[PDB]
Amino acid sequence: TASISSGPKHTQKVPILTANETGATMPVLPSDSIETRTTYMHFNGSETDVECFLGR
Amino acid sequence: TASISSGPKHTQKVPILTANETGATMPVLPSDSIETRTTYMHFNGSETDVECFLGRAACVHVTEIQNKDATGIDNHREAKLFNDWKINLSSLVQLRKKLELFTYVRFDSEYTILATASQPDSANYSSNLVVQAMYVPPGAPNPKEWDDYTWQSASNPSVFFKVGDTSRFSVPYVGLASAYNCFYDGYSHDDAETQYGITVLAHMGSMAFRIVNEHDEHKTLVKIRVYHRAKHVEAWIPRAPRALPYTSIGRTNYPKNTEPVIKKRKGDIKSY
Amino acid sequence: TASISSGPKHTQKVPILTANETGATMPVLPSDSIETRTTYMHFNGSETDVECFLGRAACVHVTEIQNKDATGIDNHREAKLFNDWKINLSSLVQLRKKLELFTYVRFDSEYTILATASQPDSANYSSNLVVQAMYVPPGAPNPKEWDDYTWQSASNPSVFFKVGDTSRFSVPYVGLASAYNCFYDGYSHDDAETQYGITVLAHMGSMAFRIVNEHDEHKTLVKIRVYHRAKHVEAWIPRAPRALPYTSIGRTNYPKNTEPVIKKRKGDIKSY
Amino acid sequence: GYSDRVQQITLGNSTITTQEAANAVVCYAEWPEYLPDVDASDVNKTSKPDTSVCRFYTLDSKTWTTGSKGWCWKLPDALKDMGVFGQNMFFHSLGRSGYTVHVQCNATKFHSGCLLVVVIPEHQLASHEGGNVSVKYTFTHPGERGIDLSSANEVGGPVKDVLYNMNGTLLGNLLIFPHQFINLRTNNTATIVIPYINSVPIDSMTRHNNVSLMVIPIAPLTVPTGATPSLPITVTIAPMCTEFSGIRSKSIVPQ
Amino acid sequence: GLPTTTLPGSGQFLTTDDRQSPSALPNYEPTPRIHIPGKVHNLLEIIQVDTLIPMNNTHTKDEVNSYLIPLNANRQNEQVFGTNLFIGDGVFKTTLLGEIVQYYTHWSGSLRFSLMYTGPALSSAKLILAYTPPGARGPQDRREAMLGTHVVWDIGLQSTIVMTIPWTSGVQFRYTDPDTYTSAGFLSCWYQTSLILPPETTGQVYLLSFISACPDFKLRLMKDTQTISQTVALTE
Amino acid sequence: GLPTTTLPGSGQFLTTDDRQSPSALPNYEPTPRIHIPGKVHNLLEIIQVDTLIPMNNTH
Amino acid sequence: GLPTTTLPGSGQFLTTDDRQSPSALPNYEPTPRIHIPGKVHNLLEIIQVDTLIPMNNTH
Amino acid sequence: INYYKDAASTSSAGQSLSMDPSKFTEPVKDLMLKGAPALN
Amino acid sequence: INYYKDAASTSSAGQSLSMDPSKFTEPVKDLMLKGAPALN
Amino acid sequence: INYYKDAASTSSAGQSLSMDPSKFTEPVKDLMLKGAPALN
């Protein structure tokens, strides 16, 4: 599976401008606004499962 | 698989002359310089594997708590009504010298906790106490009294066992980086007075102990011994073994006016 | 599979006349000299196998340690605050005579350690003590006090069990040679005064015992009994059984003015 | 006619030639390489100035005399002020680098003396005070000057006792670390290639030094009769495969 | 309900046993491993790297000088140094080899002893190193020494000489803590001809000496080292 | 009778262990589940919804 | 957790029982065996060698 | 292996590995594409 | 048989049986052959 | 079933069922046949 590689941008397509009045949290990522390099997650989110959270 | 047979030599090819200035240790064998006969190894080097070397339980900590009437005690922590321990492997030196043969080390821990009771002054009997050991990760509320809401430990792993018995559980490698640093030549930030060497890179959690029992008429001393066994060991970059005595958890410092560590000859260089 | 049927004989072939000077024991049977009938063995000789003969636990050592206030004790070892034992199989004679039927012996050991407590003088109660038995191989630091750094035992196998209980573990054959010498007609070097007979060839390690508990108001005597069972036995070269009493661990010496070991007849050679 | 003996290292816009080498050591048998994605964590694209930072900087020279105890430099500290390497260093949040270290000391066939040149990963120093006294920042960041083991104890500084490596271990066992000797009779330089060694993929270049280079006289310098009793030792070091990441405002560090 | 019987040893804690345990942190995900040069797998890997021996032990406080074996110009027939081979004690004891051997009870195998010469390049020398196998005394003169394992070393361009102490033994293991029955011999070194310095040169020259184990080597039965102890627990 | 040995840790209660237990109510039948909008499975699902920060903390 | 019941005899030590035990020295390698003439396997092997009888016991 | 008959007696459940924040993060009636204008 | 779910809870690891001293004993850049001259 | 890893930890060995007294009862160099004269 955490960040893809992304480079300079000069577009008409701006993912960082939104309207929060709508009630959504738009899924913006580091790569929408800076230049990133690939990295992997190495993680599953196992210990935040509700079974785990309420299970001790 | 130890020595091959080898006979007289009169060559232009001399394996025993080398240049140590290069930094290599050339792999010279008995058969390069005497006449040998075949012999087999009969041995694998099993018990020198690092998993084996670091894999037996070592005592890492001895603490003590007491069961007594807390009535009128203004500071439970101070009366040893309960006690914490920030986990370390560098306070008792036996295991410490072993680990510091390496620079970075990675392993799961298996803890065994033995608890025995003492009744140094007149008691009718020996009571049966249950100890509670709570694992308190950094950021959790810390116990203030021996019976705080903290001990509810609703999200924090805790084990309850009886004094005289042993408790045993195993914790995965909790380091923040890829390995634990046995050494760190750095600071936590570029501060002019921040501490040197001691780092979170080594941090393994922390543990709080208490007796669950209320008090009987006599007082009971319970002494806790924590044992630690590394399992699934991985070690990188060997270093020179520790020669001088240790003075502090986490610094390399040795004591002043220490004694010569190399044994002086009783005789000459020429002596046997 | 014990006797075949055999009838009258009038031969030139006499199996019962031999020459013992040769050193052989000729395999003569009932059927060589009387008339027999067939009978079967019905038996295998199972319980005379050397694995069986040396394979049951035998008491090899009884020692004793006490739990008491060490305050002001200048010599813990001397107060039986703790105690060592250099492992042996020749101090209690029952098992010793059995092993010395052979010259070289090779086996794994299974140890059982029973610990019971005694309170010879007025106590309110019986405390519950945990014993620690440390295996101290030659070259390890030896305990000096009952709570030295030694007891950390970070590299040395140690077992913790409760008084009244038993501890059990098994140690591989730790001999330096291919077998343990039950006997050794040699010295450690050609010295004019070095000891004769006693050898490292027999060395099996050594063991140190202590109570982990601090002291209660009374004193408690704990007496340790070590049992040893040979498993995976291999024995070479049978010898004459021991006739006279033993005097020392590791020497063959018998006591002076000992008594006749052969029972004198009450009567003649002719007596029944 | 290639000898182990003559060598040329060209890195960037700078070249070194030695006509009296004794092979070269590559720490742990690994050559410096950039940070692979599979090992990456920070999502930032990194900056690789290449030839402007990966060239040879020659630190100021030392003087070996019969009384010398040895010198110690820390990396990347020693280079904190060299050209654009240094700027990059103070300006990014994180950086990573390997190095080629070339230590030089020539004499004549009448001199004797032998230096140990060793690289120690994570050399945490000891306070000469004992106990749990710390070693202040400035003291472990001597810069190009390095630490002079024959200088006096100072307050908040490290211990400078050579038989103990500045940490409670014996000089004799430093040989377990990548190292090379300079024996006037054999050798005139020592070269060690250092791959990046850390427990994290990239780190801060200012709060943590990841190797100390140490040059220690072991067989004392002995000059021919009526020779001047000393020789200079020069250290030239080149960052290799350097990467910087997390650019911003420019760190301010004590002193 | 399945019927069981518990055996002797139940409830004991043996620091050397290896079993499963519940994880206190169910479901936790450890940090990924990244690559780090230098991984060690066996202590046998590292005792083959040679380290310096403080052979010149004759000082009174630890000094860089006890690593230096001195050589005198123009002496003939004489002896350069001597030592027994109790690798767990004496000169050997602080070396990495000595230091690891001390974590085990028994050792077997060949040792590699080398000497690197540091004298001016225009000097010359011929030394003899001799290994004396157990059973005889430390040699008292070269004649005595030369009848056992030996190497005539000719000091040249090639600066180091590697002598091997081949495993000579009845019993297949020796004790690391010095023991008689189990003893390994002596190592001595003498002038074969003599050190000669060039003109304009003077004084003593020194040899550095190293020790490491051959690939031959075996160590077994781990135990605690006499090389480290303590009187109270340390704190931060 | 099968021979056993008990290990260190026997009888301990670790609040984080996960094992089977006898049911006190053998054979009881729980109420059927009906559908309810909004099921959460991971705390990671919810920390992606944004909420307001009291940035102006100065009161 | 599997349900068990312990029988009479639990915890006893019978010097003649034969069971497994943990090794105190995990991973240790014993010295190789070499050949030695004379191996004995059964006491029945040796009681077939004849030995002298002190028949004249009258001393 | 379950040793017991009832389902309540089994150990903890196993990770949903479900994970779909959109019911919480994007419950809008007309779909919003990142990059397209929020309000047209 | 593992009785437990997590990997940390398993017993000790099993012998590397890796063993390669050359990173420590021969980290030289140009390969040295035993028997050939050290310095050419 | 061995529950333990090391060989020393296994139970007792099992009967040699070897049994050959001739090394002890007839170690003579020239073979003696029962019934034939001992000394020829």
mmCIF file of N, CA and C in Angstrom, chain C residues 89-130:
data_model
loop_
_atom_site.group_PDB
_atom_site.id
_atom_site.type_symbol
_atom_site.label_atom_id
_atom_site.label_comp_id
_atom_site.label_asym_id
_atom_site.label_seq_id
_atom_site.Cartn_x
_atom_site.Cartn_y
_atom_site.Cartn_z
ATOM 1 N N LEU C 89 28.795 -37.201 41.844
ATOM 2 C CA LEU C 89 27.795 -38.358 41.955
ATOM 3 C C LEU C 89 28.478 -39.361 42.891
ATOM 4 N N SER C 90 29.511 -38.863 43.615
ATOM 5 C CA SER C 90 30.281 -39.836 44.410
ATOM 6 C C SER C 90 30.337 -39.509 45.869
ATOM 7 N N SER C 91 29.558 -38.618 46.386
ATOM 8 C CA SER C 91 29.405 -38.294 47.769
ATOM 9 C C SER C 91 28.429 -39.144 48.546
ATOM 10 N N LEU C 92 27.258 -39.445 48.051
ATOM 11 C CA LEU C 92 26.354 -40.442 48.750
ATOM 12 C C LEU C 92 26.623 -41.789 48.049
ATOM 13 N N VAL C 93 26.965 -42.847 48.747
ATOM 14 C CA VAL C 93 27.439 -44.055 48.147
ATOM 15 C C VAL C 93 26.472 -44.875 47.391
ATOM 16 N N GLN C 94 25.199 -44.858 47.590
ATOM 17 C CA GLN C 94 24.289 -45.786 46.823
ATOM 18 C C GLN C 94 24.503 -45.657 45.338
ATOM 19 N N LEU C 95 24.158 -44.532 44.698
ATOM 20 C CA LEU C 95 24.420 -44.347 43.274
ATOM 21 C C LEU C 95 25.888 -44.537 42.947
ATOM 22 N N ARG C 96 26.819 -44.125 43.756
ATOM 23 C CA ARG C 96 28.259 -44.248 43.415
ATOM 24 C C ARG C 96 28.667 -45.652 43.126
ATOM 25 N N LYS C 97 28.309 -46.616 43.932
ATOM 26 C CA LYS C 97 28.738 -48.008 43.681
ATOM 27 C C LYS C 97 28.198 -48.451 42.335
ATOM 28 N N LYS C 98 26.959 -48.100 41.989
ATOM 29 C CA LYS C 98 26.306 -48.429 40.722
ATOM 30 C C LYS C 98 27.116 -47.866 39.565
ATOM 31 N N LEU C 99 27.487 -46.582 39.578
ATOM 32 C CA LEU C 99 28.230 -46.033 38.470
ATOM 33 C C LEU C 99 29.616 -46.663 38.348
ATOM 34 N N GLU C 100 30.194 -47.036 39.476
ATOM 35 C CA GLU C 100 31.656 -47.432 39.377
ATOM 36 C C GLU C 100 31.794 -48.873 39.002
ATOM 37 N N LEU C 101 30.732 -49.435 38.490
ATOM 38 C CA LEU C 101 30.718 -50.818 37.915
ATOM 39 C C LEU C 101 31.303 -50.725 36.485
ATOM 40 N N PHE C 102 31.434 -49.542 35.934
ATOM 41 C CA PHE C 102 31.905 -49.107 34.660
ATOM 42 C C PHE C 102 33.092 -48.137 34.804
ATOM 43 N N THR C 103 33.954 -48.041 33.805
ATOM 44 C CA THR C 103 35.081 -47.137 33.822
ATOM 45 C C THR C 103 34.765 -45.790 33.260
ATOM 46 N N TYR C 104 34.104 -45.686 32.122
ATOM 47 C CA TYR C 104 33.707 -44.432 31.447
ATOM 48 C C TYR C 104 32.164 -44.488 31.300
ATOM 49 N N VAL C 105 31.547 -43.381 31.434
ATOM 50 C CA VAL C 105 29.998 -43.424 31.421
ATOM 51 C C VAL C 105 29.625 -42.188 30.717
ATOM 52 N N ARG C 106 28.598 -42.149 29.926
ATOM 53 C CA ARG C 106 28.170 -40.914 29.207
ATOM 54 C C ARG C 106 26.653 -40.847 29.324
ATOM 55 N N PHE C 107 26.062 -39.731 29.722
ATOM 56 C CA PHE C 107 24.611 -39.638 29.866
ATOM 57 C C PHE C 107 24.169 -38.207 30.007
ATOM 58 N N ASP C 108 22.912 -37.883 29.777
ATOM 59 C CA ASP C 108 22.316 -36.568 30.090
ATOM 60 C C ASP C 108 21.808 -36.668 31.535
ATOM 61 N N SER C 109 21.662 -35.625 32.245
ATOM 62 C CA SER C 109 21.197 -35.705 33.624
ATOM 63 C C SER C 109 19.859 -35.072 33.732
ATOM 64 N N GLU C 110 19.015 -35.660 34.515
ATOM 65 C CA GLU C 110 17.763 -34.940 34.826
ATOM 66 C C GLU C 110 17.835 -34.647 36.307
ATOM 67 N N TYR C 111 17.831 -33.426 36.789
ATOM 68 C CA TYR C 111 17.868 -33.122 38.229
ATOM 69 C C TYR C 111 16.504 -32.893 38.810
ATOM 70 N N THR C 112 16.167 -33.399 39.965
ATOM 71 C CA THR C 112 14.892 -32.953 40.658
ATOM 72 C C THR C 112 15.381 -32.335 41.940
ATOM 73 N N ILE C 113 14.894 -31.224 42.360
ATOM 74 C CA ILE C 113 15.379 -30.596 43.623
ATOM 75 C C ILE C 113 14.203 -30.461 44.557
ATOM 76 N N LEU C 114 14.155 -31.140 45.642
ATOM 77 C CA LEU C 114 13.031 -30.990 46.629
ATOM 78 C C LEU C 114 13.542 -30.068 47.730
ATOM 79 N N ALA C 115 12.818 -29.137 48.213
ATOM 80 C CA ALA C 115 13.186 -28.182 49.270
ATOM 81 C C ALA C 115 12.149 -28.216 50.351
ATOM 82 N N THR C 116 12.398 -28.507 51.565
ATOM 83 C CA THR C 116 11.256 -28.490 52.595
ATOM 84 C C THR C 116 11.662 -27.548 53.662
ATOM 85 N N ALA C 117 10.729 -26.947 54.403
ATOM 86 C CA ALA C 117 11.195 -25.965 55.429
ATOM 87 C C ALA C 117 10.910 -26.544 56.795
ATOM 88 N N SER C 118 11.679 -26.129 57.740
ATOM 89 C CA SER C 118 11.652 -26.455 59.146
ATOM 90 C C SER C 118 11.683 -25.140 59.943
ATOM 91 N N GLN C 119 10.975 -25.171 61.025
ATOM 92 C CA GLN C 119 10.956 -23.952 61.926
ATOM 93 C C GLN C 119 11.138 -24.441 63.344
ATOM 94 N N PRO C 120 12.366 -24.863 63.645
ATOM 95 C CA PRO C 120 12.651 -25.449 64.945
ATOM 96 C C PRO C 120 12.351 -24.513 66.062
ATOM 97 N N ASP C 121 12.233 -23.220 65.950
ATOM 98 C CA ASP C 121 11.925 -22.543 67.254
ATOM 99 C C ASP C 121 10.841 -21.515 67.097
ATOM 100 N N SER C 122 9.800 -21.704 67.830
ATOM 101 C CA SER C 122 8.719 -20.749 67.922
ATOM 102 C C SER C 122 8.506 -19.801 66.789
ATOM 103 N N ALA C 123 7.509 -20.081 65.961
ATOM 104 C CA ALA C 123 7.175 -19.108 64.859
ATOM 105 C C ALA C 123 5.664 -18.959 64.865
ATOM 106 N N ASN C 124 5.150 -17.839 64.431
ATOM 107 C CA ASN C 124 3.686 -17.698 64.419
ATOM 108 C C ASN C 124 3.064 -18.499 63.293
ATOM 109 N N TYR C 125 3.926 -18.621 62.292
ATOM 110 C CA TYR C 125 3.557 -19.246 61.053
ATOM 111 C C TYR C 125 4.744 -19.746 60.262
ATOM 112 N N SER C 126 4.326 -20.379 59.160
ATOM 113 C CA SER C 126 5.242 -20.955 58.146
ATOM 114 C C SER C 126 5.371 -20.012 56.992
ATOM 115 N N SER C 127 6.511 -19.471 56.698
ATOM 116 C CA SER C 127 6.388 -18.352 55.590
ATOM 117 C C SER C 127 6.429 -18.953 54.250
ATOM 118 N N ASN C 128 6.141 -18.258 53.130
ATOM 119 C CA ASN C 128 6.388 -18.980 51.851
ATOM 120 C C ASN C 128 7.487 -18.301 51.071
ATOM 121 N N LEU C 129 8.556 -19.079 51.104
ATOM 122 C CA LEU C 129 9.847 -18.841 50.546
ATOM 123 C C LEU C 129 9.971 -19.393 49.116
ATOM 124 N N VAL C 130 10.677 -18.670 48.313
ATOM 125 C CA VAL C 130 11.029 -19.071 46.960
ATOM 126 C C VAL C 130 12.513 -19.358 46.959
#
